[PDB]
Amino acid sequence: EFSVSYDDRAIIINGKRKILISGSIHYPRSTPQMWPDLIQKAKDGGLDVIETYVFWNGHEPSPGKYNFEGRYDLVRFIKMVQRAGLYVNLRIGPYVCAEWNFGGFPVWLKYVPGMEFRTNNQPFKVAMQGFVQKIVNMMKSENLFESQGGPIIMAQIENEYGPVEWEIGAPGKAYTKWAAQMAVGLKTGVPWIMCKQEDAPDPVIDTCNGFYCEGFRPNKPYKPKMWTEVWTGWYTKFGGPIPQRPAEDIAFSVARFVQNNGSFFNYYMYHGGTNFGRTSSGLFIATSYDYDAPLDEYGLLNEPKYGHLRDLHKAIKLSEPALVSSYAAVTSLGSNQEAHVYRSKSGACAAFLSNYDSRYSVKVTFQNRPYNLPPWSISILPDCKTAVYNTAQVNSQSSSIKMTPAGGGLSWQSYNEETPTADDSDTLTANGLWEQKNVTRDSSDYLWYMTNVNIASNEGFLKNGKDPYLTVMSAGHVLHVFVNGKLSGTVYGTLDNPKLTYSGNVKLRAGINKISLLSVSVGLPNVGVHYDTWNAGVLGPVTLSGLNEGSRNLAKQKWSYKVGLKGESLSLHSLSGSSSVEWVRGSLMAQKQPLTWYKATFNAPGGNDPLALDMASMGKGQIWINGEGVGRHWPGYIAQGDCSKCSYAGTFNEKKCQTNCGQPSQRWYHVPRSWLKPSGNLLVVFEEWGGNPTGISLVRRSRSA
């Protein structure tokens, strides 16, 4: 009664070939209070399927101790999709990439003896098989595979391993084969897929990711052609612009794929959402994962994209009897124009009329009728006669985004974070520089590396008008250099170049000088061959020049380590209270000072509409509401890029339609309404850089035509 199989044409569900429309919604990038609404909008937007990764590091924070509660309740999310009448593509991974912290891998996994990720390595295979088996058993135990009457019609193993395999050689080939066999061996009763994996072994279907995939062919003629990631935009990085992808180009790319025998395509992202807390975002990934998705970060319709793709879906559904009972037949119409025709013996006929010219409209004649094709567009004729839809003709109105201040003027108190020093009265001393992940195990973004330097009274710089020069090199990602308790300077990296060098004159004086380096990670790397081997933190070298001796390398002296902030140890973000402390209010309140905690109590704004905090007056740090981590803020990191105006027409790339250049890369921080109560809400901000909290406002989001 229930089965999933496939043939050369399509995935076959309960014995019927289907042209499946899918979108990605990542369950932990929204709240369970949002999920039913997002799913309903996806259903109303013409999706047949919801696609999600599974996020291992979220589900297994320490070995053998699992978390499937709150926004990590994977079972509940899938059951909501089932309820709405949609299928699921479960992308287990468990490497998932996804601009997600460490690619999804638990940081603890890295420190298992003998471990090597994403290769033919026994401890990795054991841990990966163990978690995949855990997920498969949990789905089975809830009857969630389609073969059981549930929604899951397919699962993905690994993610984009093909390029890695290719670079790492024979051990990559072995691990590929192993992974595919281990997955198929779990007997889910439904197909397995691998994206970007030309050599995926039968019975696994290899699939295509990208802005366009119309030229892609699966690795056997008896496998269907599937596009697992139709990129709907691109991610936002701290320091980068907000990338957009025009609806007309997306619609063209989808029509181009479908007209060429493609039978599954999935929008990545459909709802992008938010990297809440501090274990979600990947390296330098913004708290917003909006992605220019059909549903915006806050869950509102992104018009006109949402409606324009809804209308495309309607056309595809009208075409579907023809699509599933024939194969595409191409007739050339002109220099840059084609007809892709699906003509069934049943009499059903659907046609796609294309104009690949990126500059000019062209009139074609098809079956005796003229059809005007705007540049870079495809018309869909679900009966081979009536052009119900053209990918460049948008009948949805656009809606523009407003973030309007609500409430106004919170009453703040502040608390200044200690600058610690190498008091040899520290539980963490070592005679060298240790890598940050190793020391913190990613329990905090912050690690203090501290050392004392003795200056002789007879140093020449003390007589002459001069300061010596300190160089600190770090693997990244932000570094604050404190000398004798005072911030001397701050440097910070980029996604592509997280490494840092601080070099500057420092105000050392005679006698003992205290150097305290605060090293900060901003999410962990999530993509790249051997990315899990890359370092963070101050590994040096660290040198002082300009002394009577010459230069003094400090890398082998006693280093003292403090993991995390004092406010983190005192739980200042917490509703109970973060070890209390002397909060300051009114005139003496700390302002534009580094390492300052701020807190305010507030009533929830009115309305049903989404909320954010406007953090433009702030610098960098973390936000909590009622003890729950809203995410990192970094409004001080200005967007740089090329924000040239763009046309939908012609080949898209992720830099073609960038917006927000010269603004904070993220100014507004999403606050889920369900996290609030009517009154007595506690807002805690840790401000790492320096800010004026009086400028913080709650804002309400709306979009109108």
Ligand SMILES: *[C@@H]1O[C@H](CO)[C@@H](O[C@@H]2O[C@H](CO)[C@@H](O)[C@H](O)[C@H]2NC(C)=O)[C@H](O)[C@H]1NC(C)=O
């Ligand atoms: C769409 O798909 C079908 C089947 O995948 C293609 O039909 C095949 O065409 C090749 C080369 O002409 C033949 O060797 C196959 O045996 C055909 N298969 C069947 C079952 O008809 C078709 O050519 C593809 N169309 C386009 C436009 O790419």
Ligand SMILES: *[C@@H]1O[C@H](CO)[C@@H](O)[C@H](O)[C@H]1NC(C)=O
């Ligand atoms: C990792 O931590 C241990 C101490 O807990 C230390 O012995 C080792 O050298 C560290 N290695 C690094 C930082 O690469």
Ligand SMILES: OC[C@H]1O[C@@H](O)[C@H](O)[C@@H](O)[C@H]1O
């Ligand atoms: O947003 C870019 C996307 O890149 C794809 O290659 C990857 O599979 C996704 O997980 C995501 O990282």
